[PDB]
Design a protein around this ligand. Structure first.
Ligand SMILES: [Mg+2]
Ligand SMILES: [Zn+2]
Lengths: 104, 468, 225, 52, 136
RNA sequence: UCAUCUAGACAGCCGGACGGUGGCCAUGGAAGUCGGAAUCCGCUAAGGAGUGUGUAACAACUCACCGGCCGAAUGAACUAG
RNA sequence: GGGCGUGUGGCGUAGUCGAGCGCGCUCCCUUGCAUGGGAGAGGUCUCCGGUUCGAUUCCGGACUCGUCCGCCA
C-alpha cells in the first residue's frame, strides 16, 4: 500500500505537466524537510521509461532499491519480478541438460 | 483545464509565508498554485492569465500581468471575478513574481496587489497577513525604481496617513520576521533560481540581492518596533546565527558595496540595541567576518571599495568601545589585518575617511592599540605626502586636505614630543608651498583656516619676498 | 534594468533606436513589444519619437544624440526634420551635418560631458559637435577600431568598450573620458556593443540573446541599480 | 485536460471510427464493408489507431 | 537573401551574374570575392543567376589569404556599379562592385567597411550598417 | 447444405443468467476466464466445471441460455448469372 | 549499375561450434665483420541481430575490399 501511495504522489505531480527536474528538486527539498513519501524515493528518476525506484527495508536498517513501473500496479510489478525469476529457472534447467554432453 | 494533485504537499502541512491554507514560498519548485483551485476561478479569462504567468518566458508573463491589471482597473465590472479563490492563487504566484529578475515584472506585481487592496478594502482582511509582508519587502528593495513607486502607492492606498504605514510595521511584525527567516535560513541560492537556466554566478547574485532586501527590512522593523527584540528573540537568534547574512560581507567579489553597507548598518543597529552585546556568539561571528573583510580590500579594488571604507572604520570604532577593545582580541591577527587595511586605504582617500581614522584612534588610544610614534605617525606622514602630490588635482581635494589637517592636528596634540611638532610644521609648509592653488580656492583656504601662530606665517611671507 | 527587446527578430537595439536622457527615438517599422518596452520603461516623462532618418529604418547609426542637441545627416529630408522639430522639446537643438562620413552614430560615441569621434572627421564637423552638443571632443580609436560609436557604449556613469581591447588603451580611454570602462560582450558574444544596445542614466535596452553575465556587467558598469 | 465526458464526446466523432485497409477511408465503428466504390466495398477494415 | 533578411527589398536592377568578381570591402584579409550563386534566385533555362545590391551570395576568395581561399562562404553585396532606380526615381551607381563576408545568419566575418555602402543594403542587414562607415 | 419457426423464430429494449464447487493437477498467486487434463449433477423456464472485459488472487461487468413487449420468417457456410 | 568472393594482435598468418604461431618491440641474460637465448605485451576474430548451451565457426542484414561483365553512331 505505501508503494501505491508513492506512485499516486508521483503520478499526481506528473499529471500537473510539471518539469521532471523541478519534480526531482521537489523530492530533494521534501527529503530535507522530512517527508516520508519523499524519503522512500531514490533520486535518479527514470521518468523517460515511466519507472521510479523505491527503498524498502530488508528487515521488518538495510534498505534495497526496487524499480517500479508507474503504469502497472505494485502487485503487477511484483508479478513481473516473479516472472523474471521463473524465466531464469528454465534457462538453468536447459544448462543442466547441456552439462553432460557439453563436458563430454 | 488544470490537472493533477499536489499530494506531496498535503503531508507537509507547512504553509511557509501563507497563513490561509496555501503554501506561499519563494522557491520555484513549490508553492505553485494547486490545480484544483485554479479550476475554481470565476472566469475563463482569469484562468488563462494564470497559465501564462506560469510559463517561463518573460514576454508572456508580462503580457499576462498587463492584462490582469487592465481587469483590475475596470474594477466595477469585474468585481465578481476577484474572489477569495483569486486572492489565494494570486498570493502564491505573487511571491514568486517579486523575486523575478525582470524589474517590470516586479513593479507590475506590486502595483497590482496594491490596487487589489484599495479596491477590495475590508475584504482582503483575511489575506492581509499574506500580502502585507511581501508588499513591504518590495518597498525595501535596494533598487530605487522598484522601491519608491511601491512606497508611494502604499501610502496612497492608506490615504496618505503616516500612522497607518507605521502601524503596519507594528501589526505584522511577527509575519515580517517570518519572511526574513525564510529568505535567510530556509532558502539557498539553488532553491531561489533554477540551475539549468542559470550559472553558478547570477544564482549567487540573485540570492544576495534578495537577502539584502531582507536585511534592509529587518533594520526597518527594528527601528519601527521598540519591543521587537524581546518578543521575537528566538526567531531573531536563528536568523542572526545563520552565516548567510554574514556571507554578504565579502568585498573581494560582487557588483556593489551597497549590500555590504546594509549588513554594516545591521551590526551597528544591533549594537545600539544591545542585542549583539547580549548574545556573544552572534557578535563574535559578525566581528570576525568584518575583520576578514578588511583583508579583502586590495589595490586592485580600492577605487571600487572606497565609498564604503569610512563606514567600516566607524563601525569598528564603536565596536572597539565594547569590552575594552574586545573585538580586536577575538582575532589573533586582527592587528595585522588593521595595519594592512590602513596601508591599502591610505593610498586612496575618500571624503570622511580621515575622520573615521581619527575616531578609531580615539577609541584605541586608551588601550594602546597602535604605537603613537613607531606605528601611527608613519601612517600620517605618508598620507600627507601622497595628498600633496596628487594635489589639488582632485575635486574634494579641498575638503579632503582640510580634513587631514583638522584630524592630524588633533593627533599631534596628544604627543608632547619634538618630532611630532617638527613634522607638523614641516609638512604644513610643504603642503602649502608645493600646493597647487590653495589660496585660489577660497573655500579650501577658508576650510584650512590656519596651522600655526599668526605672526610666524607673516615672517615666512617675509622670506618669500626676501628670497632670490 | 537591461531590458530584453528585439526589433522584429533583431537583437541589435542600438541600430534601430537612439536613447538619451531627455528623449528617445525609435524606428517607424517596429513591433508592439519593441514600442511597449520603451513606453513602459521610459514612462510619460520622456518623449518617444517614431522617426525615419534619410529614408532608413536605421536611426541609431545614422544620428548622434545628446541631451542638449541632436545631429542628423545631410540626406535627412525636410519633412523628417520638421517632424523631429515639432516632436522634440524646445531645449534640444537639431542641426544637419554636411560631412562625408555621414553615419553619425557609427562615427561619434558621445555622452553629456565628453565625446569620442572618428579620427578623420572634418574640423568644421568637430566644431559643429562642440557647438551644438556643448561637448568636448577627442579623436581616438578603440584598439584600432575607427568606428567608436559602433564599438563603444557610453553613458555618464560608465562605459562598455570592445572586448578585444588592449588594457593600456583601457586606462588611457578611461582617464581621457573620466569614467570607468569595462571590456565586455553583448548579444551572446557579439563584438559591436554600441550597435548592440542603448543606455542612459537609468535605463539600458539590449537584445534578447544577451546573457545573464553580460547583463550583470551592463548594470554594474552603468550603475542602473 | 478537456473533461472526461467532453473527451468522450469529442472522441465519439474523432477517434471511435474504423479505417478501410484498402483506401484509408474513415468509416463507422460497427461497419462491415467500406462505403467507397474504389476499393470495391471491401470488408478489410481495422480499428482507428488510438493513443496511449 | 532569404533567412537573415530584416524586412523585404524592392527590386534592384541585377548587375552581378555568376562568375562576377567584386572587391572585398571589409578587413578580413580577402581581396576579391567570386560569385558562384545567388540566394533566392529563380529558375529559367539558360538564365544566369544574377545579384544586386543588398543580396546575399555564395562566393569564393580567388585572391587573398590562404585560409580564406579554396572554400565557399556567404557574402553580402554592398556596392553595385550598375545603375538602378529608387522609388524616388534617382538613378544612382557606385564605381565598383564590392561585397563583404558573412555567415548564413548575416553577421560579418570582418569588423570595418571601407568606402560607401547602399542604404538598401544597410536597412536590410544591421551588422553591415553597424560596421559601415558611410551609408548612401 | 445445415439449422430455428404462430407451442412465438432473427433485430431492438427490460429482467434473471444460480448452487455442489475456491470441481482435479500445477503456481507466490490464479476461485469460469496463465495453462494441463476431464467437463458431471442439482434447481430449473434457464444458466458453460465458461464468451469476453476483468483483479496479485478476488470482487465487479458482460456474454450463450431462458423469460415480458413485438407477431412472422430468419441465421450461418457455400455455389454461379 | 549488377554478379561473385573477401575481412585475425602493431604486421603476416592457422582456424572441423568447445584464437596458435612467426615478425615489430617490453625487460633480462649474452658479444670484432653485434648476435643469439629466456620469460613479455599485443585481438571487442569488420559490425549488428537470431540459433545453440556457446558461435571465428551456423544463418540473415549492413559496411569495407578485391575480381568479372556491361552505352551510342
Ligand atoms: Mg543551355
Ligand atoms: Zn475502402
Amino acid at each position: 500500500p505505501l508503494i501505491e501511495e508513492v506512485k499516486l504522489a508521483v503520478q499526481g505531480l506528473i499529471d500537473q505537466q510539471m518539469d521532471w527536474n523541478t519534480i526531482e528538486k521537489l523530492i530533494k527539498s521534501e527529503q530535507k524537510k522530512g517527508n516520508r513519501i519523499a524519503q522512500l524515493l531514490n533520486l535518479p528518476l527514470n521518468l523517460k521509461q515511466n519507472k521510479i525506484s523505491v527503498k524498502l527495508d530488508l528487515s521488518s536498517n538495510e534498505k534495497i532499491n526496487v524499480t517500479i513501473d508507474l503504469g502497472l500496479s505494485a502487485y503487477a510489478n511484483a508479478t513481473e519480478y516473479f516472472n523474471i525469476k521463473k524465466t531464469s529457472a528454465q534457462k538453468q534447467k536447459k544448462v543442466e541438460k547441456n552439462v553432460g554432453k557439453a563436458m563430454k | 483545464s488544470f490537472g493533477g494533485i499536489n499530494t506531496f504537499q498535503q503531508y507537509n502541512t507547512d504553509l511557509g509565508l501563507g497563513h490561509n491554507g496555501v503554501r506561499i514560498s519563494l522557491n520555484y519548485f513549490d508553492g505553485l498554485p494547486d490545480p484544483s483551485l485554479l479550476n475554481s476561478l470565476y472566469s475563463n479569462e482569469l484562468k488563462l492569465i494564470f497559465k501564462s504567468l506560469l510559463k517561463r518566458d518573460e514576454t508572456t508573463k508580462e503580457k499576462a500581468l498587463m492584462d490582469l491589471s487592465n481587469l483590475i482597473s475596470d474594477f466595477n465590472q469585474n468585481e465578481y471575478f476577484f474572489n477569495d479563490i483569486f486572492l489565494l492563487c494570486w498570493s502564491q504566484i505573487y511571491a514568486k513574481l517579486i523575486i523575478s529578475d525582470y524589474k517590470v515584472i516586479r513593479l507590475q506585481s506590486h502595483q497590482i496587489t496594491i490596487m487589489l487592496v484599495k479596491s477590495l478594502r475590508k475584504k482582503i482582511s483575511k489575506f492581509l497577513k499574506d500580502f502585507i509582508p511581501l508588499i513591504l519587502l518590495g518597498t525595501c528593495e535596494l533598487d530605487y525604481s522598484v522601491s519608491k513607486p511601491s512606497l508611494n502607492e502604499l501610502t496612497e492606498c492608506f490615504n496618505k496617513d503616516p500612522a497607518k504605514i507605521n502601524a503596519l510595521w507594528a501589526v505584522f511584525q511577527e509575519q515580517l520576521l517570518n519572511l526574513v527567516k525564510e529568505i535567510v535560513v530556509n532558502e539557498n541560492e539553488d532553491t531561489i533560481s533554477d540551475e539549468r537556466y542559470s550559472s553558478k554566478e547570477e544564482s549567487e547574485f540573485r540570492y544576495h540581492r534578495v537577502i539584502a532586501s531582507a536585511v534592509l527590512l529587518l533594520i526597518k522593523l527594528f527601528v519601527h518596533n521598540k519591543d521587537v527584540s524581546e518578543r521575537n528573540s528566538s526567531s531573531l537568534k536563528v536568523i542572526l546565527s545563520d552565516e548567510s547574512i554574514w556571507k554578504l560581507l565579502n568585498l573581494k567579489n560582487g557588483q556593489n558595496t551597497n549590500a555590504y553597507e546594509t549588513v554594516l548598518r545591521l551590526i551597528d543597529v544591533l549594537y545600539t540595541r544591545g542585542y549583539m552585546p547580549s548574545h556573544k556568539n552572534i557578535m563574535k561571528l559578525a566581528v570576525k567576518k568584518l575583520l576578514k573583510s578588511l583583508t579583502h580590500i586590495t589595490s586592485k579594488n580600492i577605487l571600487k571599495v572606497c565609498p564604503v571604507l569610512p563606514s567600516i572604520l566607524n563601525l569598528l570604532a564603536t565596536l572597539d568601545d565594547y569590552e575594552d577593545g574586545t573585538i580586536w582580541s577575538y582575532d589573533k591577527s586582527s592587528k595585522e589585518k588593521v595595519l594592512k587595511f590602513l596601508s591599502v586605504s591610505r593610498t586612496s582617500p575618500s571624503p570622511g575617511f580621515f575622520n573615521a581614522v581619527f575616531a578609531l584612534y580615539s577609541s584605541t588610544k586608551r588601550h594602546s592599540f597602535l604605537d603613537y610614534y613607531l606605528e601611527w605617525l608613519p601612517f600620517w606622514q605618508k598620507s600627507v605626502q601622497r595628498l600633496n602630490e596628487k594635489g589639488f588635482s582632485a575635486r574634494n581635494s579641498a575638503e579632503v586636505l582640510n580634513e587631514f589637517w583638522t584630524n592630524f592636528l588633533k593627533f599631534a596634540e596628544d604627543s608632547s614630543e619634538e618630532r611630532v611638532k617638527k613634522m607638523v610644521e614641516s609638512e604644513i609648509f610643504n603642503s602649502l608651498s608645493c600646493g597647487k592653488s590653495l589660496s585660489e580656492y577660497t573655500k579650501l583656504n577658508q576650510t584650512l583656516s590656519g596651522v600655526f601662530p599668526p605672526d610666524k606665517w607673516e615672517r615666512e611671507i617675509e622670506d618669500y619676498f626676501t628670497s632670490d | 534594468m537591461a531590458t530584453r527587446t528585439q526589433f522584429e527578430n533583431s537583437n541589435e537595439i542600438g541600430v534601430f533606436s537612439k536613447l538619451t536622457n531627455t528623449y528617445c527615438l525609435v524606428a517607424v517599422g517596429g513591433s508592439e513589444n519593441f514600442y511597449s518596452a520603451f513606453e513602459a520603461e521610459l514612462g510619460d516623462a520622456i518623449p518617444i519619437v517614431h522617426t525615419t532618418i534619410a529614408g532608413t529604418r536605421i536611426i541609431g547609426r545614422m544620428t548622434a544624440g545628446n541631451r542638449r542637441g541632436l545631429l542628423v545627416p545631410t540626406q535627412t529630408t525636410d519633412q523628417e526634420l520638421q517632424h523631429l522639430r515639432n516632436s522634440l522639446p524646445d531645449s534640444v537643438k537639431i542641426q544637419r551635418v554636411e560631412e562625408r562620413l555621414s553615419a553619425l552614430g557609427n562615427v561619434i560615441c558621445c555622452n553629456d560631458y565628453v565625446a569620442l569621434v572618428h579620427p578623420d572627421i572634418d574640423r568644421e564637423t568637430e566644431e559643429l559637435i562642440s557647438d551644438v552638443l556643448g561637448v568636448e571632443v577627442f579623436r581616438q580609436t578603440i584598439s584600432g577600431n575607427i568606428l567608436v560609436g559602433s564599438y563603444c557604449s557610453l553613458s555618464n556613469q560608465g562605459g562598455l568598450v570592445h572586448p578585444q581591447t588592449s588594457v593600456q588603451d583601457q586606462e588611457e580611454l578611461s582617464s581621457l573620458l573620466q569614467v570607468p570602462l569595462v571590456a565586455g560582450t553583448v548579444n551572446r558574444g557579439s563584438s559591436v556593443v554600441g550597435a548592440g544596445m542603448v543606455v542612459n542614466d537609468y535605463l539600458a535596452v539590449t537584445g534578447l540573446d544577451t546573457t545573464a553575465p553580460e547583463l550583470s556587467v551592463i548594470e554594474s558598469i552603468f550603475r542602473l541599480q | 485536460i478537456i473533461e472526461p465526458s467532453l473527451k468522450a464526446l469529442a472522441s465519439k466523432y474523432n477517434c471511435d471510427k474504423s479505417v478501410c485497409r484498402k483506401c484509408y477511408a474513415r468509416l463507422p465503428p460497427r461497419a462491415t464493408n467500406c462505403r467507397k466504390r474504389k476499393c470495391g466495398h471491401t470488408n478489410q477494415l481495422r480499428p482507428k489507431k488510438k493513443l496511449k | 537573401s532569404g533567412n537573415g533578411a530584416q524586412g523585404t527589398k524592392f527590386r534592384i536592377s541585377l548587375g552581378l551574374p555568376v562568375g562576377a568578381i567584386m572587391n572585398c570591402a571589409d578587413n578580413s584579409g580577402a581581396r576579391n570575392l567570386y560569385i558562384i550563386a545567388v540566394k533566392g534566385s529563380g529558375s529559367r533555362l539558360n538564365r544566369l543567376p544574377a545579384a544586386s545590391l543588398g543580396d546575399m551570395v555564395m562566393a569564393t576568395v580567388k585572391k587573398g589569404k590562404p585560409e580564406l581561399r579554396k572554400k565557399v562562404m556567404p557574402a553580402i553585396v554592398v556596392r553595385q556599379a550598375k545603375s538602378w532606380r529608387r522609388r524616388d526615381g534617382v538613378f544612382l551607381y557606385f564605381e565598383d562592385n564590392a561585397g563583404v563576408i558573412a555567415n548564413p545568419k548575416g553577421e560579418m566575418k570582418g569588423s570595418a567597411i571601407t568606402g560607401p555602402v547602399g542604404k538598401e543594403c544597410a536597412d536590410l542587414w544591421p551588422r553591415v550598417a553597424s560596421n559601415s562607415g558611410v551609408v548612401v
